[PDB]
Ligand binder design. Sequence first.
Ligand SMILES: O=S(=O)(O)C[C@@H](O)CNC1CCCCC1
Ligand SMILES: O=S(=O)(O)C[C@@H](O)CNC1CCCCC1
Ligand SMILES: O=S(=O)(O)C[C@@H](O)CNC1CCCCC1
Ligand SMILES: [Ca+2]
Ligand SMILES: [Ca+2]
Length: 370
Amino acid sequence: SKWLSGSWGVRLIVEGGVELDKASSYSDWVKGAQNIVDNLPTVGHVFTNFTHRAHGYWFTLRENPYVDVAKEIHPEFVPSLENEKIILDVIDILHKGGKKVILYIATDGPSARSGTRNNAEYKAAWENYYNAKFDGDEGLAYRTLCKGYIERFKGLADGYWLDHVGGIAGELTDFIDMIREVDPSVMIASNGIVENESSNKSKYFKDENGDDLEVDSDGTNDPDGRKYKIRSFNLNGSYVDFTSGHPTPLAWGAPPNSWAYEEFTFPEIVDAMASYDPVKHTIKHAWMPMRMKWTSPRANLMFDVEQAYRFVRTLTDGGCAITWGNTQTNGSMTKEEMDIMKEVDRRLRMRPMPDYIPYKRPAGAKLVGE
Ligand SMILES: O=S(=O)(O)C[C@@H](O)CNC1CCCCC1
Ligand SMILES: O=S(=O)(O)C[C@@H](O)CNC1CCCCC1
Ligand SMILES: O=S(=O)(O)C[C@@H](O)CNC1CCCCC1
Ligand SMILES: [Ca+2]
Ligand SMILES: [Ca+2]
């Protein structure tokens, strides 16, 4: 379990399903994986894909011991037999490079009742399957489909990051139970529902009256005046091993480099890990987008090297983990981001590591309550 504590990581997006088939002719994810290994020796872990980013009906593997997905469900759910080797080769390079591998799953699956883009044809094909073979029990159908791939990733995936969990077929706990039944040693994070041991509301920082804090301004030249709440990652739900780390949503106007994360979110979990008790606690982990969008290289890059270095240092010094939300082009990390990752890595290899520039509240940055 402990490998995640103090680890920093990057994302290598691998597409799934028919989208992987379409992207394979002009992309090389093997190069992208080798690129990470060769340039980022200090990186401890890499996030990549069991499903396509944010889409539960596109998988990175094809063959499945419990279902011929192409013949029984829909051919676009799986890549070609040749292209299913992409994710396997990626994992081999990362493992051979000494990296741990966390696999992303959009758990709302083909019915797409959460963040997966709705696709009527995909949903109908899926319903035809689970009604014919599972007599209407979508939850068991979905767990069984996924089980086949969890089985194939045994020893390859070191963890799983579950998204869209409010739309999962059946009970999320049954789905997590299924994973642990296949491989009880993998680390599991869930983007909601089972992280907060105390409640099913999202956890925000609060004042003495129990009201949520709100950022008013990010600084004198804040480009977006929308106020936003500040997520806490101090979450110890029993079903998960590490915190999902999803910060306040970008679409609400919360920048991923928010000063409030340096002042509230990160110090809280650094302090939590200072008392880490594996019997009681998750490994505290942050997944911070590099840009104002998670996966679009055209979105504004929100980190320079000095702030990215402080983010990684602050969290990993304290035994937390951090993952970057990197973007990919043609199967390799976007250059402008790799340049930053490389400079972070360079500094982390120095002995002593150089001090980071101290966090100071930006000019004009303030809470509503100030
Ligand atoms: O980074 S991923 O896409 O794999 C998972 C999640 O963090 C992204 N959520 C956004 C929400 C806004 C619209 C598109 C998806
Ligand atoms: O993904 S779904 O819409 O199906 C599940 C939905 O309950 C999750 N969003 C809540 C509300 C906003 C703060 C975070 C938690
Ligand atoms: O987190 S809570 O549900 O307590 C309140 C907060 O989420 C509402 N934010 C919306 C979201 C996107 C449009 C602008 C405002
Ligand atoms: Ca949807
Ligand atoms: Ca703002």
